[PDB]
Design a protein around this ligand. Structure first.
Ligand SMILES: *Cc1cc2c(cc1C)nc1c(=O)[nH]c(=O)nc-1n2C[C@H](O)[C@H](O)[C@H](O)COP(=O)(O)OP(=O)(O)OC[C@H]1O[C@@H](n2cnc3c(N)ncnc32)[C@H](O)[C@@H]1O
Ligand SMILES: O=C(O)[C@H]1CCCN1
Ligand SMILES: [Cl-]
Length: 381
């Protein structure tokens, strides 16, 4: 019940941190409210996009590239499938998309490998896409799709084999922080360590107040749907890409069909404000769930608009500036916080696990994480 490090929340970020700590022989306890991977947090629905040319900001590119190399390393270490190089297509109306423009600027700044296309060039290259002639695109061939549940399961199995312990179905209810130690309280007992990593996903919005932190964090209910599609156009086997696109009523993202699962789509810039303990996790309970998806499909990917095969309900946790929080607690250098991933953190989770392990062990990281500071002005109302 004493450890070197305790990770609270063994999800996307926490489980990666656990792997990085265990690989260094650091005796780690991970505590999760469920049994990860699971369907109650932010990491299910099978698949996640990884992009390198980064439309949310060119400053994420180093972490994206480091994370990509870590995912290739993970592929080699496990029998679970980690990554498929689908490429990622980004498109939008010419001159009317900040996301597209920043994606292009990031690629230029970092000498990333991309193709530039416009109008009917897009429809011709990828049968099944129907964009207007005034749309332009940037395609990144060497990014792709992560199997997110498999990533967390592989990190867990590898960490446990090296002696990490995973206490499941155990909610942390409170914390007690001292100068020279950390303590968590649960119904199944209290545990102590030298250092704490706090990575509770959407529950960071509810429980960071138990560490005397007051940070705006808003959970959002974000659905995805898998649709019966024309496999001769939308299969990964015919090189249909992953995508993240801007259109006049917002940003949508999606995935090619893998083994006939259907094209998967989500709507990024809308979701319901929720609390993670009362969210309705059934797909289709609000009319928007299915209708906002088919509105996009009928316009832009009309042969991927068949029967709904599967739906899922997941959560984002947004900061006011939609940048992450990765830092030491301002009052407690033995406490590390990972929060506020704002709907775009999974791809970085391998690199973030490395950052969190460095912060926990040394109070520093070799990564540049200034944009993720817990003290920055734009976090606050
Ligand atoms: C929901 C979603 C997210 C998403 C996305 C599509 C959807 C529908 N598409 C993405 C994409 O294509 N590419 C990408 O890079 N990101 C994408 N995202 C976002 C991403 O999935 C999230 O940013 C990321 O998963 C956040 O990870 P985090 O580690 O913060 O969250 P988590 O995996 O849910 O893990 C939190 C864990 O904490 C446990 N927990 C909660 N409360 C407690 C307490 N009290 N005690 C102990 N454990 C606790 C949870 O159970 C969970 O396992
Ligand atoms: O993180 C990404 O790549 C996009 C996909 C959906 C949400 N954010
Ligand atoms: Cl998130």
């Amino acid at each position: 019940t004493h450890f070197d490090v305790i990770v609270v929340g063994a999800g996307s970020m926490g489980m990666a941190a656990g792997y990085q700590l265990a690989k260094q022989g650091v005796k780690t306890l991970l505590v999760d409210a469920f049994d990860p991977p699971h369907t109650n947090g932010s990491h299910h629905g099978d698949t996640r996009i990884i992009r390198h040319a980064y439309g949310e900001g060119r400053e994420y590119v180093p972490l994206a590239l480091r994370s990509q190399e870590l995912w290739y390393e993970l592929e080699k270490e496990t029998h679970h499938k980690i990554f498929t190089k689908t490429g990622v297509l980004v498109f939008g109306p010419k001159g009317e998309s900040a996301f597209v423009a920043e994606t292009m600027e990031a690629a230029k700044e970092h000498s990333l490998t991309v193709d530039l296309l416009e109008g009917d060039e897009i429809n011709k290259r990828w049968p099944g896409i129907t964009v207007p002639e005034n749309y332009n695109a940037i395609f990144e061939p060497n990014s792709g799709v992560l199997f997110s549940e498999n990533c967390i399961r592989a990190y867990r199995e590898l960490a446990e084999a090296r002696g990490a312990k995973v206490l499941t179905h155990t909610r942390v209810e409170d914390f007690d922080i001292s100068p020279d130690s950390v303590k968590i309280e649960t119904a199944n007992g209290s545990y102590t360590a030298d250092k704490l990593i706090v990575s509770m996903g959407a529950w960071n919005s509810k429980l960071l107040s138990k560490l005397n932190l007051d940070i705006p964090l808003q959970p959002y209910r974000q659905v995805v749907g898998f649709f019966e599609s024309d496999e001769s156009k939308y299969s990964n086997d015919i090189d249909f890409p992953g995508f993240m696109v801007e259109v006049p009523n917002g940003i949508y993202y999606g995935f090619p069909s893998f083994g006939g699962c259907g094209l998967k789509l989500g709507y990024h810039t809308f979701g319901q404000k929720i609390d993670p303990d009362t969210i309705n996790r059934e797909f289709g309970v609000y009319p928007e769930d299915e209708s906002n998806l088919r509105a996009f499909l009928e316009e832009y990917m009309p042969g991927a608009n068949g029967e709904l095969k599967r739906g899922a309900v997941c959560m984002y946790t947004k900061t006011l500036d939609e940048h992450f929080i990765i830092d030491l607690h301002p009052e407690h250098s033995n406490v590390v916080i990972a929060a506020g991933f704002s709907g775009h953190g999974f791809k970085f989770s391998s690199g973030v696990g490395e950052v969190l392990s460095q912060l926990a062990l040394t109070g520093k990281t070799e990564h540049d994480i200034s944009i993720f500071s817990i003290n920055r002005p734009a976090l606050k109302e």
